[PDB]
Amino acid sequence: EYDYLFKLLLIGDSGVGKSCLLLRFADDTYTESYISTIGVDFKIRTIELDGKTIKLQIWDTAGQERFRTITSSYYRGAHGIIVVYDVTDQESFNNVKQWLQEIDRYASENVNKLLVGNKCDLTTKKVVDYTTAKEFADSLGIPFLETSAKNATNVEQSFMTMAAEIKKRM
Amino acid sequence: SLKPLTLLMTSSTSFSETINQWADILKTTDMEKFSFDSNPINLLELVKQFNLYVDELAITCEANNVWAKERIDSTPNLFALYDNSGGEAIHGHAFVPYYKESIVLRRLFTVDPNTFNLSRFAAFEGPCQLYCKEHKDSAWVKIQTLLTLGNGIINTLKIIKQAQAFGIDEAVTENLKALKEQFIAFQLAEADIKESLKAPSFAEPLPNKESEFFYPIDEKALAKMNGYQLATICLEELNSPKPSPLIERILSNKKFWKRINSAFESGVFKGRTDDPAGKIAKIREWHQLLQISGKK
Ligand SMILES: Nc1nc2c(ncn2[C@@H]2O[C@H](COP(=O)(O)OP(=O)(O)O)[C@@H](O)[C@H]2O)c(=O)[nH]1
Ligand SMILES: [K+]
Ligand SMILES: [K+]
Ligand SMILES: [K+]
Ligand SMILES: [K+]
Ligand SMILES: [K+]
Ligand SMILES: [Mg+2]
């Protein structure tokens, strides 16, 4: 009773917002409260595009190094991976490098990437210029969006974009 | 029609044997001839039993004084050298170098039975993964291996129950493969730890009358601590039942209060699972009390 099923995967450093993204996007809610995801989890929202209906099997992952054994399992199966960094967190951006490497190491040959700079609403505490990020992004032809899971800003658009980008390749 | 299979749990048996039992079942059964039912599987109890194991483990490390075995400094704890937080708060916690390792242990590993996840102990997450890089073979690494496997098992099962609920079979079938592997992995790791836990020859350092959570903190050291840091300490001490000598020190000292309070008002603590709101209130009370008493 659906037209397509895409398997998505959010990776990124710990506490960069992966789960709040998944949550706003799936349930349109947000909780201020501090929980770190263990291993993996997955949520499923159904999207409509062109105007075929697409089931999104989105898998959330733990950022921490010690979970890598586990998280890395779910890489090959993904149609598209979103790598997330936190715009107020310098190192999180510096880390996209490894995150992209981990994608090479583990996921499919032709996986659809997407760079997301979350917590974009924190204007004063920001440290990674849309420009600098966007340039790096373009350096590798990977689409890029700033987003605030808190505010809703671009969370919708991000998954849409990732989904569209996938259909194009099918 | 193939036999139904599940992984049950006896009412009081511990995490370790519970795993061990499932470990047999999973090893000795040709999983092709069975149809796996995860519904009867009692996550809650498993989580309860696991956190209980985390605690016991934490206790012996401290008791056997494992952490002293593991030094090269007198830096207030194993990870102190690896903090580059600048005493900022990181998801509700500032880094405090005086934390006992066994508290750090519990906080990176116990599972929030409510969520089957982790309640953020963020300020130590970086410092810890760093220490791990520079100290393979160290007890902390061996332990954390073990505990993470713990965590894994719980997550895997949750993912199985969840996937079964949504008919996602690719997952359920593959995750059983994995679960078995985690199973053995755990049993190895459990064996492997037994050395690392051996009590060093240098005598047991004398108990701290002042806090259940931090190594001693002299008045000099405490003074250099910032708003977030002292704040973090106050919230921790409230995990004792009786008020601690330490928190009394902090709350009695008039100089420390402005920064403690502003830390509170900053809101960085809002999202703590440990009733921050409640704790904060009580801390304010105790402070108010104390300033009355110290008005002589
Ligand atoms: N201002 C703001 N804060 C956020 C946002 N996303 C996450 N946070 C904060 O950072 C914490 C970590 O997010 P979480 O989803 O746990 O990150 P994960 O570890 O990457 O899944 C949250 O609980 C929030 O306190 C955002 O879009 N804006
Ligand atoms: K916030
Ligand atoms: K049940
Ligand atoms: K033990
Ligand atoms: K109390
Ligand atoms: K206690
Ligand atoms: Mg998370």
> Which pair of structure tokens corresponds to residue B247?
């928190």
Per DSSP, the three-state class of A161 is helix
Structure tokens at B129: 């993964």
Residues on chain B touching A37 (C-beta within 8 angstroms): 117-118
Residue A74 structure tokens: 């779910």
The answer to whether B122 contacts A14, with C-beta atoms less than 8 Å apart, is yes
Pocket of ligand 1 (CB under 6 A): A 12, 14-20, 32, 34-37, 63, 118-119, 121-122, 148-150; B 91, 271
| Distance between B291 CA and the closest CA of chain A, angstroms | 32
Which of the residues B151, B182, B266 would you substitute to probe the A interface, choosing the one with the greatest number of A C-beta atoms within 10 Å? Answer: B151
Whether A35 and B132 lie within 8 Å, measured CB to CB: no
CB pairs under 8 A between A and B: 72
Contact A130, A76 (CB under 8 A): no
Dig out the tokens for B186 from the structure: 């755990």
Q: By what method was this entry solved?
A: X-ray
Of the candidates B5, B3, B1, the residue with the CA atom closest to the CA atom of residue B179: B5
Domain ranges of chain A: 1-169
- Residue B233 CB coordination number (10 Å): 24
SS3 A56: strand
Beta bridge pairs of residue A59: A9, A42
Binding-site residues of B sit at 120
Q: Which long-range contacts (CB under 8 A, 24 or more apart) does A40-44 make?
A: A40/A70, A40/A71, A40/A74, A40/B155, A40/B159, A41/B158, A41/B159, A41/B162, A42/B159, A42/B162, A42/B163, A44/B166
Q: Which is nearest to A133 in space by CA: A124, A144, A141?
A: A144
Instruction: Provide the angle, in degrees to the nearest 10, between the axes of the packed helices A155-168 and A18-27.
Output: 90
Q: Tell me the one-letter amino acid at B175.
A: N
Chain A residue with minimum CA distance to B111 = A38
Rg of chain B taking only CA atoms, in angstroms: 22
CA distance B47 to B161: 15
The closest alpha carbon to B175, from B191, B190, B159, belongs to: B159
Buried b (16+ CB within 10 A) or exposed e, A24-53: bbbeeebeeebbbbbbbbbbeeebeeeeee
User: Which tokens hold the place of A55?
Assistant: 């089931």
* Test site for ligand 1: of A20, A86, A120, most ligand atoms within 8 A of the Cβ: A20
CA distance A44 to B69: 48
What is the nearest CA distance from A36 to chain B, expressed in angstroms?
5
Within 13 Å of residue B121, how many CA atoms lie on the same side as its CB? 23
A170 shares contact with chain B (CB less than 8 Å): no
Distance CA A160, CA B88 (A): 36
Atom in ligand 1 nearest the alpha carbon of residue B120: 16
Residue keyed to tokens 């020190």: B249
Strand partners, A114: A82
Chain B residues with beta carbon closer than 8 angstroms to that of A2? none
CB proximity A5 to B under 8 Å: no
Residues in chain B preceding a C-to-N separation beyond 2.5 angstroms (breaks): none
Omega within 30 of 0 (cis) for the link into B278: no
Q: Give the separation between CA B190 and CA B153, rounded to whole angstroms.
A: 14
B117–chain A Cβ distance below 8 A for any pair = yes
Q: Which residue of A has its CA nearest to B152?
A: A39
What lies within 8 Å, CB to CB, of B261 at 6+ separation is B227, B284
CA distance B235 to B229: 10
C-alpha A135/C-alpha A140 separation (Å) is 9
- Which residues make Cβ contacts (< 8 Å) with residue B181, sequence separation at least 6? none
Nearest CB among B120, B155, B166 relative to A35 is that of B120
Residues from chain B that touch A64, judged by Cβ atoms under 8 A, are 125, 129
Sort residue A17 into left (φ over 0), alpha (ψ -120 to 50) or beta.
Answer: left
Residue B214 DSSP label: B
Per the CB < 8 A criterion, the answer to whether B226 and B235 are in contact is no
Domains of chain B: 1-71+136-199 (1.20.120.1700), 72-135+200-296 (1.25.40.830)
Contacts of B273 (CB under 8 A, 6+ apart): A33, A34, A35, B112, B114, B119
Asked if residues B88 and B105 have their Cβ atoms less than 8 Å apart, the reply is no
Contact in structure between B87 and B94 (CB atoms under 8 Å) = yes
How far is the C-alpha of B120 from the C-alpha of A87, rounded, in Å?
20
Summarize the annotated binding site of A for Mg(2+) as residue ranges.
19, 37, 60
Q: Among all ligands shown, which has an atom nearest to the Cα of B58?
A: 4
| Rounded (10°) CA dihedral A134, A139, A142, A143 | 30
**By the 8 A CB rule, do A7 and A59 touch?**
yes
Three-point CA angle B143, B149, B153, nearest 5°: 150
> Which residues does residue A35 pair with via DSSP β-bridges, in sequence order?
B119
Residue B201, classed as helix, strand or coil, is: coil
3-state DSSP helix/strand/coil percent for chain B, to nearest 5? 60, 5, 35
* Residue B283 CB contacts under 8 Å (≥ 6 apart), including other chains: B234, B235, B238, B247, B251, B260, B264
- Tell which phi-psi region holds residue B230, choosing left (phi > 0), alpha (psi between -120 and 50) or beta: alpha
Residues in chain A: 170
Can you say whether the dihedral through the CA atoms of B95, B96, B101, B107 is positive or negative?
A: negative
CATH number of A1-169: 3.40.50.300
Strands A40-49 and A52-61, bridge-based pairing: antiparallel
Cα separation, B124 vs A127, whole angstroms: 22
Joined tokens for residue B201: 């020859």
- 3-state SS of B133-196 is HCCCCCHHHHHHHHHHHHHHHHHHHHHHHHHHHCCCHHHHHHHHHHHHHHHHHHHHHHHHHHHH
Instruction: Calculate the dihedral angle through the C-alpha atoms of B188, B193, B194, B196, rounding to the nearest 10 degrees.
Output: 150
> Quick one: DSSP state of residue B29?
S
Q: What CA dihedral angle connects B71, B108, A57 and A120, to 10 degrees?
A: -90
A34, A36, A40 member nearest B272 (Cβ): A34
B220-223 contacts, C-beta under 8 A, 24 or more apart:
B221/B76, B221/B98, B222/B249, B222/B250, B222/B256, B223/B255, B223/B256
Helix (H) or strand (E) holding B53: helix B43-63
